[PDB]
Each structure stands twice: as structure tokens, then as C-alpha cells.
Design an enzyme around this catalytic site. Structure first.
Site, PDB file in Angstrom:
ATOM      1  N   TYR A 277       1.248  18.926  35.696  1.00 21.82           N
ATOM      2  CA  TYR A 277       2.107  18.163  34.811  1.00 21.82           C
ATOM      3  C   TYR A 277       1.439  16.855  34.432  1.00 21.82           C
ATOM      4  O   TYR A 277       0.850  16.168  35.292  1.00 21.82           O
ATOM      5  CB  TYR A 277       3.422  17.811  35.499  1.00 21.82           C
ATOM      6  CG  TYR A 277       4.384  18.969  35.777  1.00 21.82           C
ATOM      7  CD1 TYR A 277       4.000  20.298  35.620  1.00 21.82           C
ATOM      8  CD2 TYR A 277       5.658  18.719  36.229  1.00 21.82           C
ATOM      9  CE1 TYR A 277       4.876  21.322  35.888  1.00 21.82           C
ATOM     10  CE2 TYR A 277       6.542  19.734  36.486  1.00 21.82           C
ATOM     11  CZ  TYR A 277       6.148  21.034  36.312  1.00 21.82           C
ATOM     12  OH  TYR A 277       7.021  22.042  36.576  1.00 21.82           O
TER      13      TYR A 277
ATOM     14  N   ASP B  22       8.878  32.858  38.268  1.00 21.08           N
ATOM     15  CA  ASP B  22       8.708  33.264  39.639  1.00 21.08           C
ATOM     16  C   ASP B  22       9.914  33.006  40.535  1.00 21.08           C
ATOM     17  O   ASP B  22       9.835  33.287  41.721  1.00 21.08           O
ATOM     18  CB  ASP B  22       7.420  32.663  40.242  1.00 21.08           C
ATOM     19  CG  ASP B  22       7.395  31.128  40.250  1.00 21.08           C
ATOM     20  OD1 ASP B  22       8.000  30.475  39.373  1.00 21.08           O
ATOM     21  OD2 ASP B  22       6.774  30.575  41.184  1.00 21.08           O
ATOM     22  N   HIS B  23      11.029  32.529  39.974  1.00 17.16           N
ATOM     23  CA  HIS B  23      12.290  32.427  40.702  1.00 17.16           C
ATOM     24  C   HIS B  23      13.528  33.044  40.027  1.00 17.16           C
ATOM     25  O   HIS B  23      14.451  33.492  40.723  1.00 17.16           O
ATOM     26  CB  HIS B  23      12.535  30.959  41.010  1.00 17.16           C
ATOM     27  CG  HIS B  23      11.334  30.297  41.594  1.00 17.16           C
ATOM     28  ND1 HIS B  23      10.896  30.561  42.876  1.00 17.16           N
ATOM     29  CD2 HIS B  23      10.437  29.437  41.056  1.00 17.16           C
ATOM     30  CE1 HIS B  23       9.790  29.872  43.110  1.00 17.16           C
ATOM     31  NE2 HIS B  23       9.497  29.171  42.026  1.00 17.16           N
TER      32      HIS B  23
ATOM     33  N   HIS C 134      15.472  26.866  40.184  1.00 14.66           N
ATOM     34  CA  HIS C 134      15.116  26.492  38.820  1.00 14.66           C
ATOM     35  C   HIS C 134      14.669  27.715  38.047  1.00 14.66           C
ATOM     36  O   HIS C 134      14.256  28.718  38.644  1.00 14.66           O
ATOM     37  CB  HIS C 134      14.054  25.386  38.779  1.00 14.66           C
ATOM     38  CG  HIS C 134      12.729  25.809  39.310  1.00 14.66           C
ATOM     39  ND1 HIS C 134      12.434  25.806  40.657  1.00 14.66           N
ATOM     40  CD2 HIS C 134      11.612  26.239  38.679  1.00 14.66           C
ATOM     41  CE1 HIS C 134      11.190  26.222  40.835  1.00 14.66           C
ATOM     42  NE2 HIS C 134      10.669  26.495  39.655  1.00 14.66           N
TER      43      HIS C 134
ATOM     44  N   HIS D 121       9.312  28.444  47.229  1.00 15.59           N
ATOM     45  CA  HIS D 121       8.028  28.856  47.809  1.00 15.59           C
ATOM     46  C   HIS D 121       8.127  28.485  49.283  1.00 15.59           C
ATOM     47  O   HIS D 121       8.196  27.297  49.614  1.00 15.59           O
ATOM     48  CB  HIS D 121       6.865  28.136  47.142  1.00 15.59           C
ATOM     49  CG  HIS D 121       6.691  28.505  45.703  1.00 15.59           C
ATOM     50  ND1 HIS D 121       5.932  29.580  45.301  1.00 15.59           N
ATOM     51  CD2 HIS D 121       7.207  27.962  44.572  1.00 15.59           C
ATOM     52  CE1 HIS D 121       5.986  29.682  43.985  1.00 15.59           C
ATOM     53  NE2 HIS D 121       6.731  28.700  43.516  1.00 15.59           N
TER      54      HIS D 121
ATOM     55  N   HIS E 226      10.908  18.866  38.791  1.00 12.31           N
ATOM     56  CA  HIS E 226      10.093  20.066  38.656  1.00 12.31           C
ATOM     57  C   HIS E 226      10.476  20.791  37.349  1.00 12.31           C
ATOM     58  O   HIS E 226       9.615  21.227  36.576  1.00 12.31           O
ATOM     59  CB  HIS E 226      10.207  20.990  39.885  1.00 12.31           C
ATOM     60  CG  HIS E 226       9.340  22.212  39.798  1.00 12.31           C
ATOM     61  ND1 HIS E 226       8.004  22.219  40.149  1.00 12.31           N
ATOM     62  CD2 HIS E 226       9.613  23.460  39.352  1.00 12.31           C
ATOM     63  CE1 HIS E 226       7.507  23.428  39.962  1.00 12.31           C
ATOM     64  NE2 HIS E 226       8.459  24.196  39.457  1.00 12.31           N
TER      65      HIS E 226
ATOM     66  N   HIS F 189      12.181  29.039  36.347  1.00 16.51           N
ATOM     67  CA  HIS F 189      10.836  29.515  36.073  1.00 16.51           C
ATOM     68  C   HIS F 189      10.743  30.993  36.401  1.00 16.51           C
ATOM     69  O   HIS F 189      11.564  31.518  37.167  1.00 16.51           O
ATOM     70  CB  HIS F 189       9.755  28.727  36.854  1.00 16.51           C
ATOM     71  CG  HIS F 189       9.425  27.389  36.260  1.00 16.51           C
ATOM     72  ND1 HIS F 189       8.851  26.369  36.995  1.00 16.51           N
ATOM     73  CD2 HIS F 189       9.543  26.922  34.992  1.00 16.51           C
ATOM     74  CE1 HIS F 189       8.672  25.318  36.208  1.00 16.51           C
ATOM     75  NE2 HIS F 189       9.075  25.632  34.985  1.00 16.51           N
TER      76      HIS F 189
HETATM   77  C1  LIG Z   1       2.937  26.877  43.477  1.00 17.79           C
HETATM   78  C2  LIG Z   1       3.163  26.207  42.122  1.00 17.79           C
HETATM   79  N1  LIG Z   1       4.041  27.078  41.338  1.00 17.79           N
HETATM   80  C3  LIG Z   1       3.763  27.625  40.144  1.00 17.79           C
HETATM   81  O1  LIG Z   1       2.757  27.403  39.535  1.00 17.79           O
HETATM   82  C4  LIG Z   1       4.751  28.568  39.486  1.00 17.79           C
HETATM   83  C5  LIG Z   1       5.954  27.831  38.911  1.00 17.79           C
HETATM   84  S1  LIG Z   1       6.815  27.074  40.129  1.00 17.79           S
HETATM   85  C6  LIG Z   1       3.706  24.796  42.309  1.00 17.79           C
HETATM   86  O2  LIG Z   1       4.943  24.610  42.085  1.00 17.79           O
HETATM   87  O3  LIG Z   1       2.925  23.857  42.680  1.00 17.79           O
HETATM   88 ZN   LIG Z   2       8.660  26.184  39.117  1.00 16.59          ZN
HETATM   89 ZN   LIG Z   3       7.526  28.739  41.596  1.00 16.13          ZN
END
Ligand SMILES: C[C@@H](NC(=O)CCS)C(=O)O
Ligand SMILES: [Zn+2]
Ligand SMILES: [Zn+2]
Ligand SMILES: C[C@@H](NC(=O)CCS)C(=O)O
Ligand SMILES: [Zn+2]
Ligand SMILES: [Zn+2]
Lengths: 266, 266
Positions: free
Chosen positions: A190, A87-88, A83, A224, A159, A85
Site C-alpha cells: 500500500y 482470499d476471505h 474484509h 491469516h 486494511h 478481499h
Molecule cells: C498476506 C497478505 N495478504 C494478501 O496479499 C492477500 C489480501 S489480504 C497481507 O495481508 O500482508
Molecule cells: Zn486483505
Molecule cells: Zn488475505
């Protein structure tokens, strides 16, 4: 006299930004990201595929790992995403500039990527990155084939609207290994119920639990790694404790049902 | 009182019938035949391909080697052939009975195979084997793709009308390896000039020298390994002295020109 606040950088745990050497998952599949963010290189006679890149600052590290694997910038053919975001998908724009790679993504992911993650349904402009354009739009169940490895898209909205599980079959110790790179099923902070920006959020999540449960899934990986019980720093035991897709979906659903109850109470 | 002679079995040097363990050529390509006859297994996520089987009595040995490699009888999908003589296609009928394999071959090879090598243009009924049927007829330049490995047929008529070079790209030490399994370019005991059963034999051979010279050819292998300077019993140095396709073609042509001169003198 109080000024407006400074912009806040999107900061993350050190382990998310901790470089690691390439870790083999199967004969042509390697983890090449950081200790706590997945970035999968799949190596083909007809060029390489990258699924996710992690954070924006991981671009050169990824390129270094690819080089270590015998993949030069021009050898990278395709980028696929779980997705969009920060961090990916964070380094995707830079990767496109620095390599021959084209991005395939679904319409939702493409639109979020093109916005650099701004105006996020839940995060607003809290977590953004350099925008990038998709070269190819994929539909649910659509396959993309690179040097004989067939990647299949399985939409699992929730997500993010465009959240996708990617599946492919590699080989290991002589036998085929059906790898499932399933997207996140979390909902961090959320608003789940009556969200005006995502009215069918709950129903999408429930369908996504069922989708993830049913994937072809000899090995599960997740953006993750902790979410699928991977420990990339654990070397030969990195994947030993990995969840099944069924267990991952079940865990996510139980957690989601708890979050629903807490929101109702809140 | 003199009776007609006994049938003569097709007997061969012991090294042709000497079993060897699988010898790796590239990441998915293995020599699984005997010390002096090639039989190539190419292992795919979508099943295995065998190029040649050697002599009729090598069937169980081949199946044993496949097993050692993690390939069960039902995993063998395709058999391809250099040419349909007894010392390369000999076990094909039995392999078809004992595995799921289908045979693809050109029209000439299919017709000779279906005759079990009888009525050979040069050998007559001297060198025969159990007949087998082709499942698919291939044309010159036609490709067959199995789990992402693309095999291309390059017709090189002469040794037999249906003689074929097969080419495919595997990988090794991170890089692609363009393998050329080029057929024999010999003419053992053949009448070359004015052969009523093969009037354009000489012209076909000359075209086949040029074809072999021009193949995509990082590594050359041949049905009789000695012809390409392979030494399968040499382990890690098996392929060290291997000829290039250009050198193999040049050697074959010089030898052929000598045979032409000797025939004219004879
Ligand atoms: C670990 C946490 N991730 C983030 O806050 C960054 C966007 S996925 C989650 O998805 O719960
Ligand atoms: Zn995310
Ligand atoms: Zn993430
Ligand atoms: C080695 C010799 N081969 C045979 O006589 C068996 C049929 S190819 C040749 O091709 O010259
Ligand atoms: Zn022959
Ligand atoms: Zn032969």
C-alpha cells in the site's frame, strides 16, 4: 508484434488452499477452512454462522466440513466477514446460491463485495472474485444474535475501509471464552502517505491498532492464522502460541511504523 | 392422659435422598439432584438455570454438583419450578440466600411457595418447607431467555393449581433436542370430585393431559423420574426407556380415570 498480456489469475501459496478437517476452537466454534486461511463455523441451536470463507475455490470444501459438523446447507443462517478481499470473501456468492445464508456487512464491505473486489483502493483489479450482495448493513458496535450467541461488530478501517473485528463469547472447559476474530492490520504494497484514494489511511490504521488492543479477547483469531501465531496444522497445539489482541496490535503498529519510514525513504 | 401428637416430619424413600453425580442429558442440560428426584441444571454462557431443587436437605448437594460443573453460587441466575411441593421446591429459600438466583413462577406457584407449602389444597400442613418469594411472575406461554436458551412456560394445572411444564431446545450429537420437563400428573390421595377447595379439578386435569400430549418433546423428563421411565442410577442407559410426552399423558389419564371410578365406588 507484442499483444496485450493475458489476465493473471490470483495465485496463492499451496498452504492457503490445503484442506483440513474441522478444528475445534471452543464448544460451538470451529475452524473449517484450509491450513492457512480462516473460515469460522459457529454452531447454534438456531442454525450456523460462518465468518469468512477464504478463497473462491473453497466453497465445496466448506460445505463438506459443515456436513461433517452436522450442518446442512439450509442450516447455515448467516455469513459475516472480516474484509471483502478474494482470499476471505471469495466463495460468498456461491455459498449464498447453495445455502440459506444471508450476508451481514458494513456499508464499505458491502460495496466492495458487490464489486467482487474490483477497483480495490490498492490492488485495482488484480485480486477479484464473484460479486455478492449483502442482505443486511451493520453499523459500528451493532450486534447480531443467532441462537443466543451475540456477535458484535468493531470497525477497524485500514486494511480495507470496511475491515471489521467480530467478537462473541463461547464456552470451554466449563468457562466462558471471549473470542476476538480481528481483521488483518497489514498494508501489503500500500501507498500509505498522501494516497488520493484513501487520504486518512494513516489515521484510520492508528485508531484500528487501539481498537484491536482494547477488544474483549480471551482468544484471538485472524484471517491469516499466522498473523495471530496460530498453526492450524498443529492439532492440539494449534492455538498454543496464539498472540493476545494487545500483542497483535503492537506487532502490527511497529511493522506499520517501519513501512512508513521505508516509504518516506523510497 | 393422652397428649396431642408430635409433629410428623415429611419422610421419604431413601432413593429420593440418595446423592448422585451430575448426569448429562444434553450438551448444556444435566440432572444434578438425587437418584429419585429431578433437579435440572442448564448451563449457559450467561449463567446457569436450575429447574427444581428436590427436598429441603438437598441444598448443599446441589451447590456441590454445580461446583463440579463449573457453576459457582453467583453463576446461578434463575430457579424455575415444576410445582411448589416440598419434594421439588424444598431448598429454594436456602438456594436464594446462598446464590444470586431469582425465582420465576406463575401466580399460583408463587403463592404456594410463599406459604412454604402450608394450607395445601389436599395435604393441608402435612408436607411443608421453608417459604420463599418469587422475583418474577410468569404467564402461560411466557418465555424467559437466559444466554440464548429460551424457556417456555406451559401451564398444566391439576397436581397443583400452579403446575407448569417447562420446554427448551438444547443440542446433542450435532442436532437440536427439544426437552420437555413436564410436571406431575398424579393425584395422590386427592379428592377429585366435588372438591370444595378445587371445584374444577377434573376439567383442569383433562386439559393438562392434552397439553402434555402436545408439547415439543424429543426428550421428556419429570420431577419424579420414574413417572417418565427414567432411571438416573442406570448411567449411560438412564434415559433409554423414557416415555414420550404422549405416552406419559396417556398413562396419567388412564390412571386418573381409574382413580375417578375408585372414588365413586369409595
Ligand atoms: C498476506 C497478505 N495478504 C494478501 O496479499 C492477500 C489480501 S489480504 C497481507 O495481508 O500482508
Ligand atoms: Zn486483505
Ligand atoms: Zn488475505
Ligand atoms: C409420588 C407421589 N408424590 C408425593 O406424594 C409427594 C408430592 S408430589 C405422587 O405424586 O403420586
Ligand atoms: Zn407434588
Ligand atoms: Zn413430588
Amino acid at each position: 508484434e507484442v499483444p496485450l498480456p493475458q489476465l493473471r489469475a490470483y495465485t496463492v501459496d499451496a498452504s492457503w488452499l490445503q484442506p483440513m478437517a474441522p478444528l475445534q476452537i471452543a464448544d460451538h466454534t470451529w475452524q473449517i477452512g484450509t491450513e492457512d486461511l480462516t473460515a469460522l463455523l459457529v454452531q447454534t441451536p438456531d442454525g450456523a454462522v460462518l465468518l469468512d470463507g477464504g478463497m473462491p475455490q473453497m466453497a465445496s470444501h466448506l460445505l463438506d466440513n459443515m456436513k461433517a459438523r452436522g450442518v446442512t446447507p439450509r442450516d447455515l443462517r448467516l455469513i459475516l466477514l472480516s474484509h471483502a478481499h478474494a482470499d476471505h470473501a471469495g466463495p460468498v456468492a456461491e455459498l449464498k446460491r447453495r445455502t440459506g445464508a444471508k450476508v451481514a456487512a458494513n456499508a464499505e464491505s458491502a460495496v466492495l463485495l458487490a464489486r467482487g473486489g474490483s477497483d480495490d483502493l490498492h490492488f485495482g483489479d488484480g485480486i477479484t472474485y464473484p460479486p455478492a450482495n449483502a442482505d443486511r448493513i451493520v453499523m459500528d458496535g451493532e450486534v447480531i444474535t443467532v441462537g443466543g450467541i451475540v456477535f458484535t461488530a468493531h470497525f477497524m478501517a485500514g486494511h480495507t475501509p470496511g475491515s471489521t473485528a467480530w467478537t462473541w463469547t463461547d464456552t470451554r472447559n466449563g468457562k466462558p471464552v471471549r473470542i476476538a476474530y480481528a481483521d488483518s492490520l497489514s498494508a501489503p504494497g500500500y501507498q500509505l502517505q498522501g494516497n488520493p484514494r484513501y487520504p486518512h489511511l494513516i489515521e484510520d490504521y492508528r485508531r484500528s491498532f487501539a481498537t484491536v488492543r482494547a477488544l474483549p479477547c480471551d482468544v484471538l483469531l485472524t484471517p491469516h492464522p499466522g498473523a495471530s501465531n496460530w498453526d492450524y496444522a498443529a492439532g492440539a497445539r494449534a492455538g498454543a502460541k496464539a498472540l493476545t489482541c494487545k500483542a497483535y496490535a503492537d506487532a502490527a503498529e511497529q511493522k506499520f511504523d517501519g513501512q512508513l519510514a521505508k516509504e518516506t525513504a523510497g
